[PDB]
């Protein structure tokens, strides 16, 4: 049905909220501290860590010597008379798993864990830069607009495949080949047909994201190359360049932090009875009636820190800023022009110099489901005229050289608003990027 899918998604949100409510009490957090997204991020990672048990499926964590492997934790931020202090907590993974299951009526409710994994992915995509991770692979750093989901853990299942961008899959495939060429046994033994089945699916996953017959036909030859080498790497890079113009279709799910679902459940909002959808107005309505706080570093502009959180909640980092600027009712600027840094607080930072602020995650309209940068057409058309030409590579080039919104009062899309884009401002979030690189 279309209403029972809204009910199963609803009970998932309920579980996340009821979980967050419970942990806010066990850690004896204020209501303000409970709505602090920094505490939400820590509470989120811990439960993911409790079920991950060092598989790097729900998250990735760096090892530390002497740390009991059977316990999880993170920094919890608490305030007294306006001064924040970091406190590191340690909980047994087993107990975290029990609280999560108890909050989900006894079920493992793994879909709720992945839900928070996506949110972490969206936030990282919006906060950090992967230009070094691209350059250290042979890819063009100007493919940043293709890297949705590139921070998802190494062993994320098909869960993350849906939101992984063309650029993310291309690199993943390239990496597999680069150690298939520097280790004989990679495709040998059943340890090899282990990785061949994965190579085939990852190829067909990326094939499915392409929406031109020529792009898919060339992925077929990459898939059915019995031993891929530096030849297939070259054409995967070519496909990535074609994806800057003949963009592929990628999922964009609006996953909000637990500090939003948490208080909403305490309000008495039973998401199972009334329903929920990651697509449409419900995620906008949660944020509009939300109240989330965030720590602020000296000289960080609270308005910009709000934008990057709002953009991560809506998974819009890879959309045109002129379009989102009209929806938000305010200019949503490129990352390079944001006078702020990440939401997470490093271990080295001075906590006495930290302030709080209400995040502005509100929008003026909502949406469902413009020329290209010069940086992107330059990257797309730096093809290897140098060397190999082909069949469908020449056709794809030919195709490349050829190249709703509603008011929140409009609850089910009656009067669509024709948009007004101001062509003055840049369209890509990554134009003149200034942000930290991931890890």
Numbering used by the authors: 21 to 389, 418 to 451, 462 to 497
Task: Recite the paper's sentences.
NP is a multifunctional protein that influences the structure of the vRNA, with essential roles in nuclear trafficking of vRNAs and replication. However, mutational analysis and structural information suggest that RNA binding is mediated by a basic groove located between the head and body domains.
Despite its ability to bind to and be stabilized by 14-nucleotide RNA, no RNA could be resolved from the crystals produced in its presence. Most of the oligomerization loop could not be resolved, with residues 390–417 and 390–437 disordered in chains A and B, respectively. The structure of the NT60 R416A NP is highly similar to other published IAV NP structures, with root-mean-square deviations of 1.2 Å compared with the WSN R416A NP (across 439 pairs), 4.0 Å compared with the WSN NP (across 393 pairs) and 5.5 Å compared with the HK97 NP (across 429 pairs). The major difference between the structure presented here and those previously determined is the position of the 73–90 loop, the deletion of which produces an approximately fivefold decrease in RNA-binding affinity. We observe that the C-terminus of the NT60 R416A NP folds towards the RNA-binding groove.
